[PDB]
Amino acid sequence: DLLVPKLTASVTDGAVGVTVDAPVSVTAADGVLAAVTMVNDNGRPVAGRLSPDGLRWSTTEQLGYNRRYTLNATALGLGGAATRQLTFQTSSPAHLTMPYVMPGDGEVVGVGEPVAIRFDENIADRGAAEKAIKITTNPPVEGAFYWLNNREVRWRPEHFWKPGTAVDVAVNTYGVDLGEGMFGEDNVQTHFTIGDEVIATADDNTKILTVRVNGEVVKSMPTSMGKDSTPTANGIYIVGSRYKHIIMDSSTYGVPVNSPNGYRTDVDWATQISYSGVFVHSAPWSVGAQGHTNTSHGCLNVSPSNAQWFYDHVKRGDIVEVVNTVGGTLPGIDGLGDWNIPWDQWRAGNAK
Numbered sequence: 001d002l003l004v005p006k007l008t009a010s011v012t013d014g015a016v017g018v019t020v021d022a023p024v025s026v027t028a029a030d031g032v033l034a035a036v037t038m039v040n041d042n043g044r045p046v047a048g049r050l051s052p053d054g055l056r057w058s059t060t061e062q063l064g065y066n067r068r069y070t071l072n073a074t075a076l077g078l079g080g081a082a083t084r085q086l087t088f089q090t091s092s093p094a095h096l097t098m099p100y101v102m103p104g105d106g107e108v109v110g111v112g113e114p115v116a117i118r119f120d121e122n123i124a125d126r127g128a129a130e131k132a133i134k135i136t137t138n139p140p141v142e143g144a145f146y147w148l149n150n151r152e153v154r155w156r157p158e159h160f161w162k163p164g165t166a167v168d169v170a171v172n173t174y175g176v177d178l179g180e181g182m183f184g185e186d187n188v189q190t191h192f193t194i195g196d197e198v199i200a201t202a203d204d205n206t207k208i209l210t211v212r213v214n215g216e217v218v219k220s221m222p223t224s225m226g227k228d229s230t231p232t233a234n235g236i237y238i239v240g241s242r243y244k245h246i247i248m249d250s251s252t253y254g255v256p257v258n259s260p261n262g263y264r265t266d267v268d269w270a271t272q273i274s275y276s277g278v279f280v281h282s283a284p285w286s287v288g289a290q291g292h293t294n295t296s297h298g299c300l301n302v303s304p305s306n307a308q309w310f311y312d313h314v315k316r317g318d319i320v321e322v323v324n325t326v327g328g329t330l331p332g333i334d335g336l337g338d339w340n341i342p343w344d345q346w347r348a349g350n351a352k
């Protein structure tokens with residue numbers, strides 16, 4: 001004997017806290033869908049599509065926070081007709097946080113470049129945030145998340161990227177509970193590629209900044225680094241932004257200008273390598289000391305032509321390594337200091 005059609009939805013009638021990170025769907029068995037409509041509270045229909053075989057209907061546009069939706073579906077079969085009405089209520093956030101991802105879409109960056117997702121609000125459930133961030137790499141390589149502060153999480157492999165790696169970042173935070181009633185305001189997505197290996201090494205024993213490109217020495221720059229009382233920290237630096245010129249203002253990095261180690265200086269050809277305020281930059285006033293003596297507040301002073309060369313040939317995500325200074329080691333949570341955190345510590349993370 002014949003059977004009556006059955007209607008199954010990806011939600012149920014009376015549901016609350018329905019999350020809007022996924023489409024809503026309806027499926028017919030023992031029959032086909034003859035009509036499916038979904039309206040919000042205000043009678044506005046929601047866009048949807050019925051599969052060609054008539055069995056599956058799904059929403060096709062974003063579903064909104066704080067809504068009551070009503071589904072009406074009818075299924076017909078040889079055995080008769082069935083109709084259902086489902087009303088459900090979606091998540092009601094207390095807060096919304098918007099994520100901002102670096103590096104930029106379509107960019108080509110150095111082998112030291114981490115994926116960065118910065119939220120504009122403190123994240124209570126770091127684990128939920130991590131889970132919602134989908135990273136694809138090609139060639140595939142293991143990586144892991146680490147939080148630099150309450151708002152910004154970083155993802156990187158254990159070692160520098162292999163040049164030519166495609167990296168894809170899907171921050172799928174819309175509809176996701178990030179804790180304490182905070183939900184993602186929107187999704188973001190970036191895709192970037194790893195370019196040549198560029199590693200510049202500043203050795204305090206020689207006072208030379210050597211630039212190597214895929215293992216080959218292409219540039220050797222006499223440099224003057226931080227004087228003993230304001231040394232350049234040892235360790236690994238990720239290259240950040242670059243400037244044809246910039247006013248370096250110590251107060252930006254915590255030191256009052258009118259302090260003994262304060263300064264406010266206009267400089268050319270400046271490449272930032274730490275949030276703490278270390279740059280490679282043109283320093284014509286210390287060209288005599290470069291290659292011989294440290295005289296700066298911590299920056300890598302090099303000649304005008306070498307600073308410009310550095311500006312022209314080094315890109316975001318390239319690496320500067322400092323060795324043998326009287327300084328300590330650059331903090332791992334500096335912002336550009338990710339690689340100074342040991343991998344076991346990085347991999348274990350701090351989602352807590």
Ligand SMILES: *C(=O)CC(=O)[C@@H](C)CC(=O)C(=O)O
Binds near residue numbers: 263297
């Ligand atoms: C960088 O943060 C500050 C520096 O170390 C350079 C600007 C050089 C410098 O301060 C100097 O007086 O030579």
